[PDB]
Design a protein around this nucleic acid. Structure first.
Ligand SMILES: COc1cc([C@@H]2c3cc4c(cc3[C@@H](O[C@@H]3O[C@@H]5CO[C@@H](C)O[C@H]5[C@H](O)[C@H]3O)[C@H]3COC(=O)[C@H]23)OCO4)cc(OC)c1O
Ligand SMILES: [Mn+2]
Ligand SMILES: [Mn+2]
Ligand SMILES: [Mn+2]
Ligand code: NA
Ligand code: NA
Lengths: 189, 481, 483, 190
DNA sequence: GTACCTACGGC
DNA sequence: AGCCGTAG
DNA sequence: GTACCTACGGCT
DNA sequence: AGCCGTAG
């Protein structure tokens, strides 16, 4: 599933995590194959906050990301072994895309935290006009979201580890009531 | 530039949570619909898929809905349309399907390219008066279309067909009800705003499942109607009968709502195979389109068949609970509601719909009467009208001269200029006069309704009674005390 | 019906299927160069008003309407056929204008039909031009609830322009694409000489012209294909040898043969290197980008002969591919192996028929309009007596009969008078009616001149073809090298 | 994939081979589950005349039919072991349905010939023309094609084995030219 | 969101 | 512990 | 085309 | 070989 880049110098290499093969094809055609890799996901990915370790380690999508990043996970994580110094989240420009992004960030925070701390995790900013990235032509996906000369990438920053720990547990954990209370308190209709 | 993980998580998760709550998994209290079902039904109306017209290929219906209103996968649209066509899923089906639309055994429908669909007669009542400024239209997802925020829903569809939905931070589980009972309940509420839940339960006995069956007791029903939450015990319709040679059998003809018949049978077979139940010699599904649901459980000679039946209730879905959790969108916000609240919000929607329709009809009739007044002047002075037009070199000059000479408005002069020569015949002349006289009587009838809130409320009652008389049916589920 | 013999059952059921695949699936019509699925998509786009000036429509909506109205088959067959028509690497003159992921040369599929959008290209307007001018025969659709064209007017030679490939039953087809300037020039030369030879036609039509450009080795395979309808054409990638530094060299491939999957061709080169079936390759990279275009780099070992390596790659990989020409098309609803002249002759006959039918339609339409104007002229000249006749009439039928008898009018003329709006009575209308009528009489004589002289009609076909050539004709892409 | 019947008395049991899962579901609903089994086929099935034995034996659709029939194949065929005395071919009343029928008959003739000779192979006659079997309601599929009181089944008969051998080889074999010659000779373009 | 069979002809 | 039904 | 992977909550 | 492209 991984459509890797030519270069083997991780400092200049970027990996784009897209939602499906519909966005994958566009991304593969539009990219700079020398420094940009594409990893198409399979829609909604496993929530590691609700899953046990055996299920996480057996999940094909989670495995594919670990293999592609080349760092290893948890206590065995090695930042020097990172295959890309830019891990770019490029989900579709819809509410489900926002959900996949939360699920991806949950996985990186709980299994690859030093990757966030090193500033390797990014969020792509595609235009609002199209929902599915498959709706976009390869040239417009390049110019607006992948071209380093014109793109606007958001570098994911970790400020407070205690606050982040509580945020991931509340939003993604098994306790429905704290999530329901968060919605009630912050919902703007 | 930079983005804090905590801020990113809170914002992205709330955006998704909110969208699932107000725009996916929860039904609106007014029409009892979720966005996908509302878009299908509105789509069916826009495509002219009424019960009198022939069936249209499902893929064409789905493609239009997907493109115009629902920017999601076709399976979500198609499977939602399939559910609305199943007499075992919907207490009052909303879609009339042609082809394989699935079974109680969990068999899927045929591919959308093979099946065909149209509205049911009762769906006309959900859509009735939608183009009479009765409900608010909103912009679609891309701004290229318009879609209804809610349907007029001339029968109480939330409670009639029920709802089930898994959202974020909450879920919903509203059981279906009998339409005769519901309308009678709405009528009683319309005559007494202070009616109690207990009083409403004189009309609404409890849920009424499309799959019939039994409900054990009223305590679970009562708790659910009073608070919006309660556990309802559903039982299959089962009898014990002789089969010859002193042997007996258990015959199941009705199963609990949302229970897959094939999976319930396999669970009985599993229990027998693993010796977790004693006394069963055979297990057959004798169900046919021509005989209805018929599950046969053969009992060993001299074994107590009632003991076996009771064990089946304890150990299989032959007895299933329905966990009532009545969450619906009230003013665009999710709310746990009791029976009275659901009926109150529904009755308010109906009063608003009938008032708005009466206001729309008045404006249109007044506009048409104004045009007919112009046409009547033209017919009364047709020789002078023709001369005025003939002496004008342009359309603009004819317009201004007609307005000036005969004290006509721009709209009246335009209607006169658009009038075809065939409108000057004896029959066509009289048609204009007869329409105008009928319109004047219609205008006063509408003004009478708008001047008296009691007359308006009686019209809501009368229109609900008509739907009750036409679509109301017998109770299916037996509530045993 | 009781019994059925297995031999009779097999022969009838197999022939029914075989025939349907031949005349209604896998083979293109010689006239418009289309198979039923492609014709139904284009007709569908026209009926839905999906012209190049209007915004793109969601592919699922186009496909659903085509499936429901004309093509009772799977949506993937419809959608994937529409996708190919939108690919500049598949179609020499694309027929569909696509918005979104429509696939690549690496065999990547298009995005799901719910994501993509489409409309006609400007050249497709030329395939559909005059369809509603009684130029082609319409037939009943599969269920009798619709009407569909049996063939498109096809105002440019689309069979040869875009080519065709199809696997039928008992036969197949493989027609390569061609250059539109060359084809129209060939049609023009044929129109001035019915006895033109294949060799003479080849002065205009050099050979195939692939959307993927590249090279053709020699004219012998082209000649045989044009003379008989069958021949083997050697296609070569566009490859050069260049320096890369430190006395080292590389092979750079910028164009590949038609219908060759670039990713699959690269994997075959890698496989040869891995299995040591080729000597001298140190690296293999696909440097293709939207900016650079196709760029396949094959690094060569220092002091190794790069030309020897390139020649070995031509022999052992799709870097050199043959195009097996087998020109089978539907001629009078029957499959036929045709030569170049045959294909052009049937195409020119279709154009003569289309332009003649259009001129006949326009004449009937102008004669009908002149007849109506004559009625309106009378009504305006006696408007007071027309109004009185209508006013004294109780019904429409009575007004109709009275107008017909009193003013010597036909049923059509009386109806047009009764349908006339009061605004048509303004002062300058009588002059407009007179001017239109005088112009129409002139138009009628112009049309009658075309229909009376077969040379005038044939010159009009030539003129309209020249216009399309000037507007849509482009440069040759494939280089034909002398072997 | 097999939706078997209640009865285990093959003389009264029938197996319907239906074109697609879309047709399968409606036939499973419309049938008499006591004596009628349903085996859906995922479109175009393998042509055994063009395929070698390993490919035939490894094919999922072929294996499913052998398992369902319970007779075995070729030299190991046993008619007494037939699980159904009626094998009913139920495809769409269109050209592709006709093709699936030829492919099915090719398989029965070359691997289960005594099944044809015994009169166990039948052809269902659903309402002719228009859309597929999935377009039909369960009650209309029962009344027109599956109900023994109103259905019209065609019993497949083998008259000349030499003629049938030649027919299957010409129509379904690897030699394109003899098939092309058959089409040319018998094709009526109207 | 995904994976995977089959007919058919020619080279 | 796996199912209900809209979503990727 | 179909039965699969995934989120999500509340019943069992 | 296995691929081309309309079909189940
Ligand atoms: C499983 O349920 C049935 C399947 C079928 C077959 C089929 C059979 C398959 C198989 C796949 C298919 C599948 O082909 C796939 O379509 C995909 C459609 O989207 C595009 C993007 O990609 C296509 C794949 O290239 C192709 O492989 C079906 C599509 O339409 C058919 O007719 C195909 O993989 C294994 O065996 C027939 C039936 O009854 C008639 C069924 O009930
Ligand atoms: Mn998506
Ligand atoms: Mn069919
Ligand atoms: Mn599909
Ligand atoms: Na989906
Ligand atoms: Na080669």
């Amino acid at each position: 599933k991984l459509a890797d880049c030519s270069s083997k110098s991780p400092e200049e290499c970027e990996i784009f995590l897209v939602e499906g093969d519909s966005a994958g094809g566009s991304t593969k055609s539009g990219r700079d194959s020398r420094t940009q890799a594409i990893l198409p996901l399979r829609g909604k990915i496993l929530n590691v906050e609700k899953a046990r370790l055996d299920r996480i380690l057996n999940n094909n999508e989670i495995r594919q990301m670990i293999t592609a990043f080349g760092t290893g996970i948890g206590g065995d994580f090695d930042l020097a072994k990172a295959r890309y110094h830019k891990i770019v989240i490029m989900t579709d420009a819809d509410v489900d895309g926002a959900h996949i992004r939360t699920l991806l960030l949950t996985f990186f925070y709980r299994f690859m935290r030093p990757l966030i701390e090193a500033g390797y995790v990014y969020i792509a900013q595609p235009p609002t006009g199209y929902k599915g990235l498959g709706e976009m032509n390869a040239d417009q996906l390049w110019e607006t979201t992948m071209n380093p000369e014109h793109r606007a990438l958001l570098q994911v920053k970790l400020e407070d580890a205690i606050e982040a720990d509580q945020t991931f547990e509340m939003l993604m954990g098994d306790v429905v009531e704290n999530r329901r209370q968060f919605i009630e308190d912050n919902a703007v209709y | 530039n930079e983005r804090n993980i905590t801020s990113e998580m809170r914002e992205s998760f709330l955006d998704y949570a909110m969208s699932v709550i107000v725009a996916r998994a929860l039904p609106d209290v007014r029409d009892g619909l979720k966005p996908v079902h509302r878009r299908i039904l509105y789509g069916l109306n826009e495509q002219g898929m009424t019960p009198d017209k022939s069936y249209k290929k499902s893929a064409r219906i789905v493609g239009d809905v997907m493109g115009k209103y629902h920017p999601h996968g076709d399976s979500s649209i198609y499977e939602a349309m399939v559910r609305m066509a199943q007499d075992f899923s919907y207490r009052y089906p909303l879609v009339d399907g042609q082809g394989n639309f699935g079974s109680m055994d969990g068999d899927g429908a045929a591919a959308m390219r093979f099946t065909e669909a149209r509205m049911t007669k009762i769906t006309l009542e959900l859509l009735r008066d939608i183009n009479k400024d009765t409900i608010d239209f909103i912009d679609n997802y891309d701004g290229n279309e318009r879609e209804p925020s809610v349907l007029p829903a001339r029968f109480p569809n939330l409670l009639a067909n029920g709802a089930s939905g898994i959202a974020v931070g909450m879920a919903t589980n509203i059981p279906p009800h009998n339409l005769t009972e519901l309308i009678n309940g709405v009528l009683s509420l319309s005559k007494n705003p202070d009616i109690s839940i207990a009083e409403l339960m004189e009309d609404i006995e409890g849920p009424d499942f499309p799959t019939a069956g039994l409900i054990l007791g009223k305590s679970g029903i009562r708790r659910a109607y009073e608070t919006g939450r309660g556990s309802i015990q559903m039982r299959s319709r089962a009898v014990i009968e002789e089969r010859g040679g002193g042997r007996q059998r258990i015959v199941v003809t009705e199963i609990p709502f949302q229970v897959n018949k094939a999976r319930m049978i396999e669970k009985i077979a599993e229990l027998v195979r693993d010796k977790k139940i004693d006394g069963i010699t055979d297990l057959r599904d004798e169900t046919s389109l021509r005989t209805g649901v018929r599950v046969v459980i053969d009992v060993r000679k001299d074994a107590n068949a009632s003991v076996i039946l009771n064990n089946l209730y304890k150990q299989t879905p032959l007895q299933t609970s329905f966990g009532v959790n009545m969450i619906a969108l009230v003013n665009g916000r999710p709310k746990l509601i009791n029976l009275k609240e659901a009926l109150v919000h529904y009755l308010e929607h109906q009063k608003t719909v009938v008032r708005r329709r009466t206001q729309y009809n008045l404006r249109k009739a007044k506009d048409r009467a104004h045009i007919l007044e112009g046409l009547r002047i033209a017919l009364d002075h047709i020789d002078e009208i023709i001369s005025t037009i003939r002496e004008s070199d342009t359309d603009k000059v004819a317009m201004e001269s007609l307005q000036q000479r005969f004290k006509l408005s721009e709209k009246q002069a335009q209607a006169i200029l658009d009038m075809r020569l065939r409108r000057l015949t004896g029959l066509e002349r009289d048609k204009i006069e007869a329409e105008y006289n009928e319109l004047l009587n219609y205008i006063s009838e509408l003004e009478t309704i708008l001047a008296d809130e009691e007359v308006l409320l009686q019209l809501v009652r009368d229109e609900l009674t008509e739907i009750r008389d036409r679509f109301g049916d017998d109770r299916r589920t037996e509530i045993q005390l």
